[PDB]
Design a protein around this ligand. Structure first.
Ligand SMILES: *[C@@H]1O[C@H](CO)[C@@H](O)[C@H](O)[C@H]1NC(C)=O
Ligand SMILES: *[C@@H]1O[C@H](CO)[C@@H](O)[C@H](O)[C@H]1NC(C)=O
Ligand SMILES: *[C@@H]1O[C@H](CO)[C@@H](O)[C@H](O)[C@H]1NC(C)=O
Ligand SMILES: *[C@@H]1O[C@H](CO)[C@@H](O)[C@H](O)[C@H]1NC(C)=O
Ligand SMILES: *[C@@H]1O[C@H](CO)[C@@H](O)[C@H](O)[C@H]1NC(C)=O
Ligand SMILES: *[C@@H]1O[C@H](CO)[C@@H](O)[C@H](O)[C@H]1NC(C)=O
Ligand SMILES: *[C@@H]1O[C@H](CO)[C@@H](O)[C@H](O)[C@H]1NC(C)=O
Ligand SMILES: *[C@@H]1O[C@H](CO)[C@@H](O)[C@H](O)[C@H]1NC(C)=O
Ligand SMILES: *[C@@H]1O[C@H](CO)[C@@H](O)[C@H](O)[C@H]1NC(C)=O
Ligand SMILES: *[C@@H]1O[C@H](CO)[C@@H](O)[C@H](O)[C@H]1NC(C)=O
Length: 341
């Protein structure tokens, strides 16, 4: 029966948000999202091939606008420094822990979902189903590393809009998540992250063999970022309200590609940050007393490749990205909205 035309349209959101919670993601979804589909139904689309493009699907920008909305309402800095002004207010300690959000089509439209195990984000898909809503997607803001997302079903996948353009971000979708366990124990700003060295280097070596496949068997080097602001040169993430900055030099080490134990990353909790929203500079209050612990799964990696190296034997890759959209993209690549014609 069904037939369609690809189109863009305004989505709505659904969640399990508990309405008794003071947590901020739950509050936001409690008043800006409906409940989740109590009877979710996925329909296989028989013998259809559908072209997808994760680098040009308007669901990314909608999710982005939502996360901006949530952070503007939820976070309370003591002082905001935007475009030549300075707004001051009260900065209490909030409750912070992202919850999965579902995205759903209005009537006359439907979501398509690519189920090709190794599909790279662009191109034809031969196992296409139709859903009302995406799956639940945690809105985890981070640089350098993708946290608390979804793994690739089969092999590690390299995602890029154009691998030959070195200004285009590369996303690595891992097959196997590696824990990063970060703790500020009871200088109150100093904390550390622990990663399994064995698993990390096994995964990293696999990552460069895949990168070797895509880059004509060339030698693949990892280097740290070549300067910039701390949110660029550090793996940054929010744990329990505190903004964490971690040094990833030990992770992107090439000789391990006597190193087999726990890798310990030095980190600092910052009160003064440069808002990822682009608006400007923000100041929050000193950290919570006692132990501050967050355990997360690395499930993907963000990478930028140097240019001016074509007449070399090497290709060198630094952690990076910057644009938060790619985060959302890393979970929305297998979806696209269509208009039922
Ligand atoms: C298509 O995807 C489904 C769901 O992921 C899975 O059972 C299998 O990989 C494929 N099934 C068929 C019948 O092609
Ligand atoms: C993704 O697959 C298409 C073929 O459908 C191919 O042209 C493109 O190069 C692939 N992208 C990457 C990054 O391998
Ligand atoms: C971490 O990854 C495992 C699968 O490798 C999964 O079972 C677990 O729920 C993940 N934890 C979080 C918080 O996503
Ligand atoms: C991970 O993917 C690599 C190739 O990309 C493969 O060698 C390995 O078997 C995969 N591991 C799992 C657990 O799927
Ligand atoms: C990919 O990027 C390269 C380098 O920027 C560019 O010259 C080329 O035209 C692009 N190719 C495609 C198919 O977009
Ligand atoms: C995380 O690290 C802390 C201190 O380094 C340790 O006490 C705790 O057992 C770790 N938790 C997990 C789940 O690895
Ligand atoms: C790393 O993982 C291995 C299995 O690959 C496990 O035996 C060990 O507990 C882990 N070691 C550390 C230091 O996390
Ligand atoms: C690249 O290397 C792989 C294994 O390392 C090998 O099977 C393949 O022949 C090489 N490809 C080219 C084009 O040389
Ligand atoms: C990370 O640590 C190394 C030494 O371990 C240091 O040289 C480097 O400057 C640090 N990174 C940043 C961004 O400060
Ligand atoms: C990842 O998920 C775990 C369990 O839900 C949570 O404790 C941790 O804070 C999350 N990490 C981030 C960066 O949100």
């Amino acid at each position: 029966v069904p037939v369609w035309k690809d189109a863009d349209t305004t989505l709505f959101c659904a969640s399990d948000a508990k309405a008794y919670e003071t947590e901020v993601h739950n509050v936001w979804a409690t008043h800006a999202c409906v409940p989740t589909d109590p009877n979710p139904q996925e329909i296989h689309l028989e013998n259809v091939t559908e072209n997808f493009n994760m680098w040009k699907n308007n669901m990314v920008e909608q999710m982005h606008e939502d996360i901006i909305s949530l952070w503007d309402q939820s976070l309370q800095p003591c002082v905001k420094l935007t475009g030549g002004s300075v707004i001051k207010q009260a900065c209490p300690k909030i409750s912070f822990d992202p919850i999965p959000i579902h995205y759903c089509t209005p009537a006359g439209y439907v979501i398509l979902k690519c189920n090709d195990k190794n599909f790279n984000g662009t191109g034809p898909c031969k196992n296409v189903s139709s859903v009302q809503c995406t799956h639940g997607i945690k809105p985890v803001v981070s640089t350098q590393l993708l946290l608390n997302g979804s793994l690739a079903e089969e092999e590690i996948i390299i995602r890029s809009e154009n691998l030959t353009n070195n200004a285009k971000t590369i996303i690595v979708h891992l097959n196997k998540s590696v824990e990063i366990n970060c703790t500020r124990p009871s200088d109150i700003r100093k904390a550390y992250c622990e990663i399994n060295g064995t698993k990390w280097n096994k995964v990293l070596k696999q990552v460069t063999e895949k990168l070797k496949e895509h880059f004509n068997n060339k030698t693949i080097i990892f280097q740290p970022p070549s300067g910039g602001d701390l949110e660029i040169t550090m793996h940054t993430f929010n744990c329990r309200g505190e903004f964490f900055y971690c040094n990833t030099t030990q992770l992107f080490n090439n000789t391990c590609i006597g190193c087999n134990g726990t890798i310990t990353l030095p980190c600092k909790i910052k009160q003064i940050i440069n808002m990822w929203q682009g608006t400007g500079q923000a100041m929050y209050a000193p950290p919570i007393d006692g132990k501050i612990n967050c355990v997360s799964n690395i499930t993907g990696i963000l990478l930028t490749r140097d240019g001016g190296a074509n007449n070399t034997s090497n290709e060198t890759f630094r952690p990076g990205g910057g644009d938060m959209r790619d985060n959302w993209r890393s979970e929305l690549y297998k979806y696209k909205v269509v208009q039922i014609e």
